[model samples]
Target: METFAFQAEIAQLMSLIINTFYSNKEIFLRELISNSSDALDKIRYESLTDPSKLDSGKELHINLIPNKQDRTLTIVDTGIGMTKADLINNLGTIAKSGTKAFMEALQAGADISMIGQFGVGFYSAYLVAEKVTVITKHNDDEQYAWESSAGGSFTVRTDTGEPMGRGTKVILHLKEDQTEYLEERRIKEIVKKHSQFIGYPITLFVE
Candidate 1:
């Protein structure tokens, strides 16, 4: 496992999110689901020109699995999964926009057009989850797990579970004060309100 500490600025931002963002913790679900949608969009677009990128048999969808016994909730998606480097950049770094990176990648690129401009939405999970684990598999990289307690550091390692083939699974360890989020009805309501138009199928797995 590889571990790293957040930069001073990012630690401060984490503190702000935990304190000032708790009142709006429910929005974390929305933000995460939206991110899943974005990931799905990217992969689908890539498949438009590169048929091999489609991977033959995977549907674009999101799965929400709430387990009260484990005191955890998992949000799974069949999307453009992250590599080890991507896990570091997307999770460890804050406010790093995907669109910004893409634009900067081009020597002839200019301004305008954006996607995932603020990387902090994933951190909102810290408001209700004491720790979050992201298991992802990218086409170009091996499956890996990135986890953090949202303290000041995080760890990344190869995943041991069954391969997800492609995409990501975010497992949220619920805080004692936020166990109510484990309810199926409540989760469905949240999805209906915040992510109904995500352009991807969103299903809450009861088992």
Candidate 2:
């Protein structure tokens, strides 16, 4: 496993997000789903140039799996997954230029409602989860897992388990007080409210 410290600015940004950026914690779901949609969009665009990208036969959709026994909620998407480097760069740090602008906007008390626009929406997972684990497989890279506890650092390693055909899976080990998100009805309502118009179908896996 390779461990990396969060970028200096990323640490500060995470602090601000968990403490003040969003008042409603439920929006974390919306942010995650929106990200999935973007990932799906990326693969669709790439497939135009390289048809083999879709050889996995995975449908373009999002699946929500909520496990009450484990107190975990997983959001899976058939999208363009991340490479090892992509995980390190994308999750560990933001673009230097974007970071400065994003931090300034947050500090200036600007109403940045859609934090995803700033490229730090992933950190919003920390708002409700104690830890987040992402398993992804990109057409050009090996499957890898990125795990973080919203601490100063995160780890990325090869996934030795079953192969994930293609795409990404974000598993949130929810905080004790955030169990409401484990409800099927609640998740459906949130998806309906924020992502009803998403191009890909979003389905909840009810056990």
Candidate 3:
């Protein structure tokens, strides 16, 4: 049995993803919210096979908490929380080789795709956040948080909170200029534009 690590190029891809695509940057919230919906879908589907795993209507779907004082937006979801490997695979690397394909195209002066991360649509948080934190809790593991500034390395640690069952909470520390994203109007508009296609409810919070 053996394990693997993310290719260093994936980090470069993340940098490009955050720097390119997602022109407005505010769409990072929408992208995160969209990811939450997708994760919920996976969990819901799995529950069909393993009914005992479902927590229907208990934990809720998605919540965006905007803290004015901290100038941060916390997108919380009670979907399928990611394990350590999942985090490393999903965030640590372009697990999907097509992701690198897309980035390669960008590097080669070709147009990239739109929806998938290969689409380079997500990971735009680094464009707006001087610092970003991804706090997650999984059913079979301890809670953990990962942080980075879209540079070299990221830091991961145990979360200092009660067990949240399963789900991920993404907190975006807004940059000084992108502070406008904290406005309810902007946040709402961005959600509508990027995530209104979903069947689930989407809620926004502000202080």
Candidate 4:
């Protein structure tokens, strides 16, 4: 029941995650939804190579939900979800050795770009979110909820709702300057730009 602490390198990551994305704040949704598509791609590849890998022969898909009252945006994907270790290794540590793992694989000639080599994609949510909540149900594990602001501090806990069936959902609670992101026009332009090259069908919530 005790909470854990952030790794030293992850602590330094706050400034890096925030300041590094200034020139690219508009890509907030683009980055996150790209990640979702990747998660889905992983599952699809597995299902093709091994059909039993699918949970229920479920067709892969993505969704966008806009909360006009709260001014929040939710991007949901029916992809492979994250294990607890994924949260710790990906978001918990200071070293971000996961990134190192990707770089190493890329060096070995494996396509790290398939999953977006940079770990910074998730952090781009902070460009807009006053808070971010992630709930994922990996095909391998049950489910977990990760909550955080724009810092090294984050909480990883059990999910409150039904299992996702699979994949992840990222909820961005918008900040004042980021209200423009809520508009369908802006969301369309943003997705079509940074993520157009990414391999997945991207859907935007129009309000």
Best candidate, lDDT = 2
Expressed as tens digits, the lDDT of each residue in 75-193 for candidate 4 is 89888778888876754542466545544664677542222455545766776788898988887787898877755577888887875778898988988777887788777787767
Off by over 4 Å in 1: 90-117
Compose the digit string of candidate 3's lDDT tens values, residues 24-54: 5665776677778887887777777887676
Q: Residue 29: error of model 4 in Å?
A: 2.1
For each candidate in turn, give its C-alpha RMSD to the true structure in angstroms.
6.5, 1.8, 3.9, 5.1
State each model's CA lDDT, in order: 0.78, 0.84, 0.71, 0.71
| Per-model TM-score versus the true fold | 0.85, 0.93, 0.83, 0.80
Q: Over 4 Å off in model 2, which ranges? A: 90-97
* Per-candidate count of clashing residue pairs (backbone under 3 Å): 0, 0, 1, 3
Best by TM-score: 2
lDDT of 1 by residue, 118-162 (tens): 445676677788889999998999999998886788899999999
- Residue-level lDDT of model 2, residues 78-175, one tens digit each, is 89999987887754446344556788886787654557778767777888888999999998899999898866788999999779889999999998
Superior by lDDT: candidate 1 or candidate 2:
2
**What's model 1's overall lDDT?**
0.78
For model 4, the stretches where C-alpha displacement exceeds 4 angstroms are: 19-23, 90-95, 98-117
lDDT value, candidate 4, whole model: 0.71
* Clashing residue pairs in candidate 4 (N, C-alpha, C atoms within 3 angstroms): 9-94, 10-94, 79-167
